[PDB]
Amino acid sequence: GRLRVVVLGSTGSIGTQALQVIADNPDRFEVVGLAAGGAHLDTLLRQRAQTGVTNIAVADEHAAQRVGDIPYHGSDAATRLVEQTEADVVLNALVGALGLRPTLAALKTGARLALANKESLVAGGSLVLRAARPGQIVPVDSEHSALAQCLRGGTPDEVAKLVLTASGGPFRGWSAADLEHVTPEQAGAHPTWSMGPMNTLNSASLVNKGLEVIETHLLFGIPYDRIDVVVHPQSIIHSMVTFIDGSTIAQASPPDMKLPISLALGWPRRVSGAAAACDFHTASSWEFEPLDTDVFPAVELARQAGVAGGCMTAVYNAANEEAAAAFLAGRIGFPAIVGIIADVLHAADQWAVEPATVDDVLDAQRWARERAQRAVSGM
Amino acid sequence: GRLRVVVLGSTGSIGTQALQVIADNPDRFEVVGLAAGGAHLDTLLRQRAQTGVTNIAVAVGDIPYHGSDAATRLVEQTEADVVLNALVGALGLRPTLAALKTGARLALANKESLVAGGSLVLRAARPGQIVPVDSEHSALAQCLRGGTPDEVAKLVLTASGGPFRGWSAADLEHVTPEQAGAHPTWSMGPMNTLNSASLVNKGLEVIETHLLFGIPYDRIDVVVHPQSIIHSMVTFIDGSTIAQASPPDMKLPISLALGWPRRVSGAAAACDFHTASSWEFEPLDTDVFPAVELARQAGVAGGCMTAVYNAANEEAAAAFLAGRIGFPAIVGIIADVLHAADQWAVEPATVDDVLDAQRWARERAQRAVSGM
Ligand SMILES: [Mn+2]
Ligand SMILES: [Mn+2]
Helix, strand or coil, rough: CCCCEECCCCCHHHHHHHHHHHHHHHCEEEEEEEEEHHHHHHHHHHHHHCCCCCCCCCCCCCCCCCCCCCHHHECCHHHHHHHHHCCCEEEECHHHHHHHHHHHHHHHHCCCECCHCCCCCCCCCCHHHHHCCCCCCCCCCCCHHHHHHHHCCCHHEEEEEEEEEECCCCCCCCCCCHHHCCCCHHHHHCCCCCHHHHHHHHHHHHHHHHHHHHHHHHHHHHCCEEEEEECCCCCEEEEEEEEEECCEEEEECCCCCCHHHHHHHHHHCCCCCCCCCCCCCCCCEEEEEEECCCCHHHHHHHHHHHHHCCCHHHHHHHHHHHHHHHCCCCCCCCHHHHHHHHHHHHHCCHCCCCCHHHHHHHHHHHHHHHHHHHHHHHH | HHHHHHHHCCHHHHHHHHHHHHHHHCCCCEEEEEEEEECCCCHHHHHHHHHHHCEEECCCCCCCCEEECCHHHHHEEEEEEEEEEEECHHHHHHHHHHHHHHHHEEECCCHHHHHHCCCHHCCCCCCCCEEEEEEEHHHHHHHHHHHHHEEEEEEEEEEECCCCCCCCCCHHCCCCCCCCCCCCCCCCCHHHHHHHHHHHHHHHHHHHHHHHHHHCCHHHHEEEECCEEEEEEEHHHHHHHHEEEEECCCCCHHHHHHHHCCCCCCCCCCCCCCCCEEEEEEEECCCCHHHHHHHHHHHHCCCCCCHHHHHHHHHHHHHHHHCCCCHHHHHHHHHHHHHHHHHHHCCCCEEEEEHHHHHHHHHHHHHHHHHH
16 A cells, blocks of 8 residues: 655655655655755755665766765666666656656656656657556646546547646737847746756746647647647646547646645545645636747647657757757847747758667757757857 | 437427437437427427337327326336436426336436435435436536545535626515516426526535535535536545536536446537636625525435425425515525424435425425415
């Protein structure tokens, strides 16, 4: 009954929330491994002290002078922790490139993968799916968790549409003209990291929703032309599934990542008291509006990339990272971000092939960066 | 996998929509029987002509079944997989029991069966045999797929709030039957409309919910949702709510009741998110509309108390329609009858035990009417 959990990226937002859910539910979960990059060593050490878990990994080569009591350390150490630790669930909340090999390792162990890391599916794609058995991956993100729950409303042949909700970001309802000269700061990003501005900038450009559409396709096997995005400013409905009979099933809760985190850890079993429910004691409104796809072409571009397949979604994301960096630096305008992604994709016919290995993913990403760098330098 | 369907109450709203669903899906369904009250004999004979079904009951030339218990007789003697009981009022109870005895799936629309029949109908049913047709119950059934029973925290029924949403008790004192949507100048039995205005319909659905899904009354909530796009919701122990949403259209829950657990392709239009929309939620004013709490009170007391609740409603509601009492007195009389109904908390053993409760309620309600 007590699930053994390995928590990768333990020091970030998702990881720390996951450890709180586990601490609150010692009957259901036992932490048996922790991993984080060397920059976060001090937090990781506090976590070892707090949890009593000595099976911990420094996930990269960094903090090298301060490791000597640490069982795993070095570039791919999180992967080794996964390979060597008996577990029922691996929560992969590592950020970016670091997440891919541990994902593949976790799947190979036969454990459930509670997946938070977007790169695994967006860049890894069929590499990750190739390694997974049906139902082995349980998504952690709010939208995908909603979809997984909503799909309980019918059999796979009964699914008509997956409908992802989107907040619409800070520029919801802005015209193309209004968006021409917006600054990084107006997009909610404050160019002093190129780290936290990334997730935030992706929310403004609607690239994050593009990525979520890609993940949806890979997680659930629904064609891109049956994955819709609908703007829902309250973010209370987290996503919905429309069935062939006309019924839609939706999942709703006040925003709180502890809900989807808990469900990913305990799947298929719900965790009592994970998060507050919607309170109908008070009057409220749930609003829906269509996405403006002329103004926000990032989502359709993700569908185009996803339809092409193979390493194309890795190219989409890597071109975005580069173009986003350029906008944050003041080098290009806001609308040029998705323009650059489209131009790189146009040139990326060689990257439709399925990756044989991780190296092919890495090669596609390298190529996309150089290509986006070229596009940026040209304007 | 073609299902044989008996349609009871075929000439009303639910029956005609069901026949259309069946006509559109001959590979899934086949009509094998029709039953109607006789008032709409014109429709029924029109339905005979179009369906081919001669196996018909009038609940009268060469009609195989006619009389008071004709629908019950039709059910007992027709081989079917599904019985759709869309009869209204007292008419639906014996055919429900007869349908359950056959072992066929009962696609239940008739509110009388559970509200009045109660434990008597539940004891005649195997678990899973009754599939609800009402939009709220269909939605709850779908949303319950969101977890195991031990994970259910609350059932949340949505309610339009009716025409008097936002009104005061004082506002209600001077409403016409006309104003309440139940036109007494041409009435054919406008109980559902009046019940929507008084919130008694919601009270009846709360009782039905408890009996269908075995969830305690203190965990069945009602929220007002004017759009009627979300048809009901389930909140689970982790704080997740699963909702069922669709543009209002009874063909959706009808199709699913007939084909349970399999969905019927193209039954109804889906929510269209190409155009902007708002789904509003507001609390029910339980001071002005205590009919739902009264239903919970009666449901908790149990036994024949829910049959008393509904029969007292009908009698008070008939009196309002005649211009004999005011609007707020409908639910006032229900409460008055319930307060004196101490005796009826005993479980019914026979149909006549229920009819006795109903007669008692009707009679006691009359005395309150002649008093008010
Ligand atoms: Mn998300
Ligand atoms: Mn209803």
